[PDB]
Design a protein around this motif. Structure first.
Motif, PDB file in Angstrom:
ATOM      1  N   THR D 208      58.286 -93.068 -11.907  1.00 28.92           N
ATOM      2  CA  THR D 208      57.155 -92.256 -12.510  1.00 28.92           C
ATOM      3  C   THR D 208      55.972 -93.382 -12.797  1.00 28.92           C
ATOM      4  OG1 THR D 208      58.531 -90.603 -13.622  1.00 28.92           O
ATOM      5  CG2 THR D 208      56.130 -90.728 -14.306  1.00 28.92           C
ATOM      6  N   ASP D 209      56.102 -94.369 -13.574  1.00 32.15           N
ATOM      7  CA  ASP D 209      55.017 -95.085 -14.000  1.00 32.15           C
ATOM      8  C   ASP D 209      55.192 -96.477 -13.209  1.00 32.15           C
ATOM      9  OD1 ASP D 209      52.482 -96.268 -15.133  1.00 32.15           O
ATOM     10  OD2 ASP D 209      53.825 -96.786 -16.978  1.00 32.15           O
ATOM     11  N   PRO D 210      54.385 -96.573 -12.223  1.00 28.73           N
ATOM     12  CA  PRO D 210      54.541 -98.050 -11.297  1.00 28.73           C
ATOM     13  C   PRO D 210      54.291 -99.230 -12.233  1.00 28.73           C
ATOM     14  CG  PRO D 210      52.496 -96.874 -10.988  1.00 28.73           C
ATOM     15  CD  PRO D 210      53.239 -95.943 -11.769  1.00 28.73           C
ATOM     16  N   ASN D 211      53.681 -99.069 -13.348  1.00 29.04           N
ATOM     17  CA  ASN D 211      53.357-100.169 -14.121  1.00 29.04           C
ATOM     18  C   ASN D 211      52.605-101.244 -13.546  1.00 29.04           C
ATOM     19  OD1 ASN D 211      53.505-101.602 -17.110  1.00 29.04           O
ATOM     20  ND2 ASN D 211      55.309-102.744 -16.177  1.00 29.04           N
ATOM     21  N   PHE D 212      51.311-100.914 -12.893  1.00 29.51           N
ATOM     22  CA  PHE D 212      50.402-101.996 -12.221  1.00 29.51           C
ATOM     23  C   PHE D 212      49.178-100.831 -12.066  1.00 29.51           C
ATOM     24  CE2 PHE D 212      48.900-102.520  -8.068  1.00 29.51           C
ATOM     25  CZ  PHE D 212      48.087-103.654  -8.157  1.00 29.51           C
ATOM     26  N   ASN D 213      48.042-101.593 -12.523  1.00 30.01           N
ATOM     27  CA  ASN D 213      46.854-101.205 -12.403  1.00 30.01           C
ATOM     28  C   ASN D 213      45.700-102.117 -11.609  1.00 30.01           C
ATOM     29  OD1 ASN D 213      47.877 -99.966 -14.988  1.00 30.01           O
ATOM     30  ND2 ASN D 213      46.593 -98.233 -14.259  1.00 30.01           N
ATOM     31  N   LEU D 214      44.927-101.473 -10.677  1.00 32.11           N
ATOM     32  CA  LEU D 214      43.946-102.286  -9.939  1.00 32.11           C
ATOM     33  C   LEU D 214      42.988-101.659 -10.171  1.00 32.11           C
ATOM     34  CD1 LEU D 214      43.130-104.992  -8.611  1.00 32.11           C
ATOM     35  CD2 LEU D 214      43.594-103.634  -6.464  1.00 32.11           C
ATOM     36  N   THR D 215      42.508-100.568  -9.700  1.00 35.31           N
ATOM     37  CA  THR D 215      41.658 -99.528  -9.553  1.00 35.31           C
ATOM     38  C   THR D 215      41.190 -98.843 -10.721  1.00 35.31           C
ATOM     39  OG1 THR D 215      40.211 -97.852  -7.955  1.00 35.31           O
ATOM     40  CG2 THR D 215      42.949 -97.514  -8.487  1.00 35.31           C
ATOM     41  N   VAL D 216      40.068 -98.066 -10.803  1.00 39.36           N
ATOM     42  CA  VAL D 216      39.831 -97.158 -11.816  1.00 39.36           C
ATOM     43  C   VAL D 216      40.562 -96.120 -12.254  1.00 39.36           C
ATOM     44  CG1 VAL D 216      37.319 -98.020 -11.679  1.00 39.36           C
ATOM     45  CG2 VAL D 216      37.993 -95.826 -10.741  1.00 39.36           C
TER      46      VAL D 216
ATOM     47  N   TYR E   2      41.845-100.190 -18.480  1.00 38.59           N
ATOM     48  CA  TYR E   2      43.297 -99.970 -18.561  1.00 38.59           C
ATOM     49  C   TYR E   2      43.840-100.963 -19.328  1.00 38.59           C
ATOM     50  CZ  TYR E   2      43.319-103.350 -14.548  1.00 38.59           C
ATOM     51  OH  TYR E   2      42.803-104.304 -13.815  1.00 38.59           O
ATOM     52  N   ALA E   3      45.076-100.629 -19.906  1.00 34.01           N
ATOM     53  CA  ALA E   3      45.729-101.695 -20.667  1.00 34.01           C
ATOM     54  C   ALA E   3      46.087-102.791 -19.790  1.00 34.01           C
ATOM     55  CB  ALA E   3      47.000-101.058 -21.507  1.00 34.01           C
ATOM     56  N   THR E   4      46.291-104.087 -20.678  1.00 32.58           N
ATOM     57  CA  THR E   4      46.549-105.429 -19.957  1.00 32.58           C
ATOM     58  C   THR E   4      45.279-105.900 -19.290  1.00 32.58           C
ATOM     59  OG1 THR E   4      47.530-104.666 -17.993  1.00 32.58           O
ATOM     60  CG2 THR E   4      48.996-105.069 -19.793  1.00 32.58           C
ATOM     61  N   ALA E   5      44.069-105.246 -19.115  1.00 34.72           N
ATOM     62  CA  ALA E   5      43.172-105.661 -18.608  1.00 34.72           C
ATOM     63  C   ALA E   5      42.567-106.755 -19.230  1.00 34.72           C
ATOM     64  CB  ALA E   5      41.982-104.684 -18.467  1.00 34.72           C
ATOM     65  N   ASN E   6      41.630-107.564 -18.814  1.00 34.01           N
ATOM     66  CA  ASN E   6      40.962-108.967 -19.338  1.00 34.01           C
ATOM     67  C   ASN E   6      39.870-108.308 -20.264  1.00 34.01           C
ATOM     68  OD1 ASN E   6      42.646-111.182 -18.605  1.00 34.01           O
ATOM     69  ND2 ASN E   6      41.767-111.142 -16.460  1.00 34.01           N
ATOM     70  N   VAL E   7      39.698-109.214 -21.438  1.00 31.16           N
ATOM     71  CA  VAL E   7      38.582-109.188 -22.433  1.00 31.16           C
ATOM     72  C   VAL E   7      37.808-110.374 -22.291  1.00 31.16           C
ATOM     73  CG1 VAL E   7      37.763-108.882 -24.707  1.00 31.16           C
ATOM     74  CG2 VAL E   7      39.861-107.750 -24.027  1.00 31.16           C
ATOM     75  N   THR E   8      36.451-110.253 -21.977  1.00 33.33           N
ATOM     76  CA  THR E   8      35.696-111.569 -21.645  1.00 33.33           C
ATOM     77  C   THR E   8      34.281-111.720 -22.495  1.00 33.33           C
ATOM     78  OG1 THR E   8      34.604-110.518 -19.825  1.00 33.33           O
ATOM     79  CG2 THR E   8      36.599-111.384 -19.080  1.00 33.33           C
ATOM     80  N   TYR E   9      33.912-113.021 -22.316  1.00 35.82           N
ATOM     81  CA  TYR E   9      32.732-113.168 -23.123  1.00 35.82           C
ATOM     82  C   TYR E   9      31.890-113.861 -21.817  1.00 35.82           C
ATOM     83  CZ  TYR E   9      29.159-114.800 -26.231  1.00 35.82           C
ATOM     84  OH  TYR E   9      27.986-114.977 -26.803  1.00 35.82           O
ATOM     85  N   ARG E  10      30.766-113.298 -21.772  1.00 31.49           N
ATOM     86  CA  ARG E  10      30.056-113.613 -20.417  1.00 31.49           C
ATOM     87  C   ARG E  10      30.843-114.175 -19.244  1.00 31.49           C
ATOM     88  NH1 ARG E  10      24.810-113.783 -21.460  1.00 31.49           N
ATOM     89  NH2 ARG E  10      23.893-113.756 -23.489  1.00 31.49           N
ATOM     90  N   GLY E  11      31.888-113.504 -18.865  1.00 30.71           N
ATOM     91  CA  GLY E  11      32.714-113.612 -17.854  1.00 30.71           C
ATOM     92  C   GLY E  11      34.007-114.537 -17.998  1.00 30.71           C
ATOM     93  N   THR E  12      34.016-115.208 -19.103  1.00 28.32           N
ATOM     94  CA  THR E  12      35.433-116.018 -19.430  1.00 28.32           C
ATOM     95  C   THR E  12      36.334-115.259 -20.184  1.00 28.32           C
ATOM     96  OG1 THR E  12      36.228-118.188 -19.974  1.00 28.32           O
ATOM     97  CG2 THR E  12      34.662-117.226 -21.710  1.00 28.32           C
ATOM     98  N   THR E  13      37.489-115.379 -19.791  1.00 27.50           N
ATOM     99  CA  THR E  13      38.474-114.695 -20.652  1.00 27.50           C
ATOM    100  C   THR E  13      38.912-115.193 -21.962  1.00 27.50           C
ATOM    101  OG1 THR E  13      39.786-114.016 -18.554  1.00 27.50           O
ATOM    102  CG2 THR E  13      41.002-113.955 -20.628  1.00 27.50           C
ATOM    103  N   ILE E  14      38.820-114.158 -22.803  1.00 23.27           N
ATOM    104  CA  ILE E  14      38.961-114.606 -24.470  1.00 23.27           C
ATOM    105  C   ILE E  14      39.951-113.626 -25.017  1.00 23.27           C
ATOM    106  CG2 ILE E  14      36.502-115.393 -24.352  1.00 23.27           C
ATOM    107  CD1 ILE E  14      35.955-112.758 -26.347  1.00 23.27           C
ATOM    108  N   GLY E  15      40.658-112.758 -24.222  1.00 21.62           N
ATOM    109  CA  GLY E  15      41.588-111.743 -24.861  1.00 21.62           C
ATOM    110  C   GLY E  15      42.172-110.997 -23.767  1.00 21.62           C
TER     111      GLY E  15
END
Lengths: 102, 158, 105, 216, 104, 98, 253, 146
Positions: D208-216, E2-15
């Motif tokens: 159900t959940d592929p556990n991978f996100n790239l797009t919006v 989305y979750a696990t996406a990068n948090v950046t400051y002026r483009g550099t990853t900080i979280g």
């Protein structure tokens, strides 16, 4: 969700979103004859946690993710949200579908 | 690697999708790499190095390039060396002599802004460009030969 | 290195080397046993939207280009990059006074 | 030469090299070659590393266990244990199972480490890709949850493999000749079981959940 | 985002982004930031996309780049979101479709 | 390239045998095959069309208007053959406009 | 001296393989033994080959489809479906189910002949084992590996199609029309070369280990285990080398 | 492919390299499949299978289009603005008059490139420059001159 057209790159498994966050997925798409005119009918499976958060008058759009990517169903809160909440028995419509590259 | 390559510090307003170890180019040819990237106030301080075989002009511009849709962004020293004073080791490049890529969200924002400002409206259903095309097509219909004759006569007389 | 070299749209060789000589890049390639004139024109060009590049050769002249011969810089051209195009459009449109433009139209 | 550790290391290095090689070639042909670090990790965790480590573990440890138990059965050592009032299954098979359960986690940790190292080295040294881009696309699109579930899959698979090989070696017959046939049959069964376990676990986890996100 | 996406400051990853959830006024984003990175209290959170393919992230931008800093558990009320593609395609199609081509 | 499809009005009818250079490299001669049941005509024209956006091509044949059958083995002149997009020229033509 | 110990067995294997090639190209071929060994390897390594190939290709197709569906490009999945199956899944499943089953069976059979003094019985009768036993077994190994690789690739492609279409609801026309996008003659040719080399090497290693069994009470089992380990390691190394060579040519480039 | 599906013939002017087993779409909904693309007397003919339960007017418009930029193609069967009472039965044909194809991205970019390269675009900037020289700091003076 009923609409004039389903939209290209919209297949079962497409994300349904509220305020931009996924809340469910698209189950199936079908063609329904309404007043001698074919229309698209989409069935959405939504996690009921967010149902109490979605207003009854929520705007629905079949939007595009990227130029190469597929489409997604987007729910947004209207200017004057209703006190009633979205549920399985509420008839809802898509305000618009993004234009195809064709 | 040290004592064999020249290290340069550059300041950028923004450093996106650029990581330590990314390539440094001269005229598209790899000459070095990027050591570190750290925040410096409202700027980004990027320390990189290029091989000491190659010489770089003292007034060089370090521009960040995104080669394609999906690629590894590079830093290119834009003016190729043709002589004169050279970029010495330990030099500092400020924001005035650095460049950054255009980014994709900026492209989307500008496309949306121009299509909204210069597009059709309820008061002007055809848009400014549609209206000007229609007005110029209706107002000069059949006057091409007359205008040509008038311009030729005016040119000859004057 | 390994990008296609073409003549009249059909592949004739590959790119073998790229070196920096002064303010120029000397690119060495192969023609697969074919012969081009000393007045031939080379052009680095974008092949696809995903960033593939290739060299196109238009043969000219009656003299034969000997092996290890070098085409002059005046007979070669560099591509106009897609990122350069996007940069130009966005930077120019960001400075537009769209209200003034609409009023003038 | 190192035993199970060396064989596991060599096979996992080969698998990671294959992933990096073909991956980088195909993506460079298409053009989007900065995704290799993203492509390699999901290749190793989801499909390649568990199955490959399972087959190498099967071969080395399982065939060794089958040969040892068959030799004990033929040499009447199991009869000697039963005569001396010892539960033969408890003394032999349960001890093998405990040893395998203790040893599998370090073995699969080394396998994962070497697969990742081989993929990164091939991509960023032989193909001269920048290490920053590879590390970004590797650490951005890799979830530790996938690694934990992969470890659970490998533990279950190792227990099943050890049970199968101990069964084939414990009930061996036919003298020294039958031990080799038992080894071959055990290897076939182990291959089938490993592939089936990995398939079922991946189907259950990401159905159900592929556990991978790239797009919006 | 989305979750696990990068948090950046002026483009550099900080979280990294820990969770993204819906709310009545939009979306609620919870993230973890390394304690070595201090962000100014006047910064804004802009959701961005690296390329046309995807790879969303969130960038904390502060023009001043100094002064008071945020404390753990706080919230950044100022936000920005990209222009989106579907409306842009619709606007382009409708702008081009109204031009009189025979008049052209 | 060789082995790429030759399609008549988009329907596959043959393959590309070979491509060579003629007139000192100024032109390219493409030798191709067409299904024997399909005749070509004196106004049949050939184009080279994109198969996709990653660099694949194919040959496209349009019947034309004349009914005079082109004898087998003939050559379609350069007067009615056209190339593909040439994306680099498209991108470079935007430089003065921008 | 440390390297000199395995080098002796390496030299024995190489000399035995050279003699096998000489007997193949010089002495009359043993058609009967070749047929018997071909059928033996087929019956010992066909059903496991499918039982390993079907779930593995289903798993690969599932992973590819979900990752591409999240990516957005779910119509090009068939490309990958072909690209792996022809060049890696086929030869690697061949490696596994040949080294595990057929190579070990050959080693066990020749070890059984050795411990029962049947090799000495042949040798005192003036007959040469390398021509009567090893050559048909190596040729049968090569033949069976070739056929099994073909069957594995076909079954994997068909199973991937059926799973993706009837389970993950991808479009069938996109699967069948994108198979040749990244796979062509070079890929099938390098797959054939991989299968042939893998079968030949597995047969050679199995025969060499079977002829040099140590007897005792664990000698045959130890020989079979060493055969399996050596086959796995050697076939993985050869697969790496041939994969590099094959991607040097490429369909995309 | 299920029982009750109807078979239609579509005489396309061209197929744009469309493959068989492509998707037939009504209101952008995948409801059918193209079976054969045989070419009859130099005009392509498509055999299309449509799932049961769909009403199509006899003057339905057929259009070959692109599903996505890096993806597939499809055949749209969409009713016109004035649908007729008569419906397409099994075995009926959609003529060449009602069949068309959307421009491809290659064709659109080729037209744009033809305009850009054969239209004297490098002149425009020059013209603009000169216009900028006429009006630079003189708009009030030009108005009072008028």
């Amino acid at each position: 969700v009923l609409s004039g057209r389903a939209g290209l790159s919209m297949d079962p498994g497409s994300k349904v979103t509220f305020n931009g966050v996924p809340i469910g997925r698209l189950a199936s798409i079908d063609v329904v004859e309404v007043d001698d005119n074919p229309e698209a009918r989409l069935t959405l499976d939504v996690d009921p946690k967010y149902l109490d958060l979605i207003p009854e008058n929520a705007n629905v759009e079949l939007r595009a993710t990227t130029v190469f990517g597929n489409k997604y169903i987007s729910f947004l809160s209207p200017k004057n949200p209703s006190a009633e909440r979205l549920s399985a028995s509420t008839p809802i419509r898509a305000q618009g579908v993004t234009t195809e590259f064709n | 690697r040290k004592l064999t390559n020249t290290t340069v510090t550059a300041y950028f307003p923004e450093v996106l999708a650029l990581y330590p170890g990314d390539k440094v180019l001269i005229m598209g040819v790899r000459v070095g790499s990027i050591d570190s990237i750290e925040t410096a106030g409202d700027k980004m301080k990027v320390v990189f190095h290029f091989n000491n075989k190659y010489k770089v002009p003292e007034n060089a511009t370090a521009s960040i390039l995104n080669p394609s849709l999906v690629a590894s962004r590079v830093i290119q020293l834009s003016p190729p060396y043709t002589g004169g004073p050279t970029l010495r080791d330990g030099a500092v490049l400020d924001v005035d002599r650095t460049q950054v890529p255009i980014e994709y969200d900026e492209v989307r924002n500008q496309v949306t802004r121009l299509l909204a400002d210069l597009g059709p409206t309820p008061e002007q259903p055809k848009g400014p460009f549609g209206d000007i095309i229609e007005s110029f097509a209706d107002g000069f219909a059949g006057k091409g030969e007359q205008l040509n004759r008038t311009l030729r006569g005016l040119s000859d007389a004057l | 290195i390994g990008d296609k070299v073409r003549i009249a749209g059909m592949d004739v060789g590959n790119v073998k080397s790229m070196e920096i000589d002064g303010d120029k890049v000397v690119i060495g390639y192969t023609l697969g046993g074919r012969t081009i004139g000393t007045e031939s024109r080379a052009a680095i060009r974008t092949d696809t939207i995903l960033g593939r590049k290739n060299i196109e050769i238009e043969p000219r002249g009656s003299e034969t280009l000997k092996p290890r011969g070098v085409l002059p810089v005046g007979q070669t051209s560099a591509p106009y990059q897609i990122y350069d195009a996007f940069l130009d459009v966005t930077r120019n449109a960001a400075g537009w006074d769209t209200q003034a433009v609409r009023q003038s139209l | 030469i190192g035993g199970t550790v060396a064989i596991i290391g060599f096979v996992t290095l080969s698998a990671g090299s294959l992933i990096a090689i073909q991956g980088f070639a195909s993506l460079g042909n298409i053009g989007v070659e900065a995704f290799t670090g993203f492509f390699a990790a999901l290749a190793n965790i989801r499909v390649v590393a568990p199955v490959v480590t399972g087959q190498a573990l099967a071969a080395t440890v399982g065939a060794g266990a089958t040969a040892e138990l068959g030799a004990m059965r033929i040499s009447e050592e199991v009869d000697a244990l039963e005569v001396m009032g010892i539960k033969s299954i408890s003394y032999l098979v349960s001890t093998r199972i405990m040893a395998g359960a203790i040893v599998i986690i370090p073995l699969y940790a080394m396998a994962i480490l070497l697969s990742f190292m081989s993929a990164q080295l091939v991509t960023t040294i032989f193909y001269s890709q920048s290490v920053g881009t590879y590390e970004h696309y590797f650490h951005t699109f890799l979830r530790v949850d996938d690694v934990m579930w992969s470890f659970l899959e490998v533990i279950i698979m190792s227990v099943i493999v050890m049970l199968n090989h101990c069964y084939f070696g414990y009930f061996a017959s036919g003298g020294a000749v039958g031990v080799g046939e038992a080894v071959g049959r055990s290897m076939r069964t182990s291959l089938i079981a490993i592939v089936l376990v990995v398939l079922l676990a991946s189907l259950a986890l990401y159905g159900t959940d592929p556990n991978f996100n790239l797009t919006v | 985002l989305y979750a696990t996406a990068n948090v950046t400051y002026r483009g550099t990853t900080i979280g990294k982004v820990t969770s993204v959830e819906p709310s009545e006024s939009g979306a609620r984003v919870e993230m973890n930031i390394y304690d070595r990175y201090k962000i100014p209290a006047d910064a804004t959170a802009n959701v961005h996309s690296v390329s046309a393919v995807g790879e969303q992230f969130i960038d904390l931008t502060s023009d001043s780049g100094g002064g008071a800093y945020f404390q753990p558990g706080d919230t950044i009320t100022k936000a920005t979101v990209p222009a989106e593609v579907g409306p842009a395609l619709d606007a382009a199609e409708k702008g081009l479709a109204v031009l009189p081509k025979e008049k052209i | 390239r060789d082995g790429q499809f030759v399609r008549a009005a988009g329907v596959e009818v043959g393959k590309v045998k070979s491509v060579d250079l003629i007139n000192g490299g100024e032109q390219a001669e493409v030798k191709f095959t067409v299904e024997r049941s399909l005749p070509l005509f004196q106004e049949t024209t050939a184009a080279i069309r994109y198969q996709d956006l990653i660099g694949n091509r194919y040959l496209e044949l349009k019947r034309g208007d004349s009914d005079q059958i082109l004898p087998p083995g003939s050559t379609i002149p350069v007067e009615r053959t056209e190339p593909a997009l040439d994306l680099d020229a498209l991108v470079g033509g935007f430089r003065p406009l921008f | 001296g440390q390297l000199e110990k395995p080098l002796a067995t390496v030299g024995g294997f190489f000399k035995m393989s050279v003699m096998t090639g000489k007997a193949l190209f010089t002495r009359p071929f043993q058609w009967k033994e070749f047929v018997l060994q071909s059928w033996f390897l087929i019956r010992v390594a066909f059903l496991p080959t499918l039982a390993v190939s079907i779930p593995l290709t289903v798993l690969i197709i599932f992973t590819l489809n979900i990752l591409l569906a999240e990516f957005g490009a779910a119509d090009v999945s068939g490309a990958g479906a072909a690209l792996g199956a022809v060049t890696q899944l086929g030869p690697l499943v061949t490696v596994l189910v040949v080294a595990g089953a057929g190579s070990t069976a050959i080693c066990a059979d020749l070890g059984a002949r050795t411990v029962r003094e049947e090799i000495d019985a042949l040798e005192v009768l003036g007959i040469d084992p390398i021509e009567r036993l090893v050559v048909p077994r190596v040729v049968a190994s090569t033949f069976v590996a070739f056929m099994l690789n073909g069957a594995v690739i076909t079954i994997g492609l068909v199973g991937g199609f059926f799973f993706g279409v009837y389970i993950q609801n991808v479009s069938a026309g996109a699967y069948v029309s994108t198979l040749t996008l990244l796979t062509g003659f070079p890929e099938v040719l390098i797959s054939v070369v991989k299968a042939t080399l893998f079968g030949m090497i597995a047969g050679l290693v199995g025969c060499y280990r079977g002829l040099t069994v140590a007897g005792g009470s664990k000698g045959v089992g130890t020989a079979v285990n060493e055969t399996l380990v050596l086959c796995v390691v050697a076939l993985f190394a050869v697969n790496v080398v041939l994969t590099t060579i094959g991607v040097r040519f490429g369909t995309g480039r | 492919t299920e029982s009750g599906s109807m078979t239609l013939y579509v005489q396309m002017p061209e197929t744009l390299a469309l493959n068989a087993n492509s998707r037939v779409r009504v209101r952008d909904v995948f409801v059918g499949r193209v079976r054969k693309i045989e070419l009859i007397n130099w005009v392509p003919t498509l055999t299309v299978d449509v799932e049961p339960g769909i009403k199509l007017p006899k003057n339905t418009l057929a259009k070959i289009g692109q599903t996505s930029l890096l993806g597939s193609q499809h055949v749209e069967l969409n009713p016109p603005e004035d649908p007729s009472s008569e419906l397409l039965r099994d075995g009926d044909t959609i003529p060449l008059a009602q069949s068309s194809a959307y421009p491809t991205i290659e064709r659109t970019l080729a037209g744009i490139s033809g305009i850009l390269t054969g239209g004297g675009i490098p002149n425009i900037e020059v013209i603009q420059t000169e216009v900028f020289n006429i009006l630079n700091g003189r708009a009030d003076q030009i108005r009072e001159f008028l």
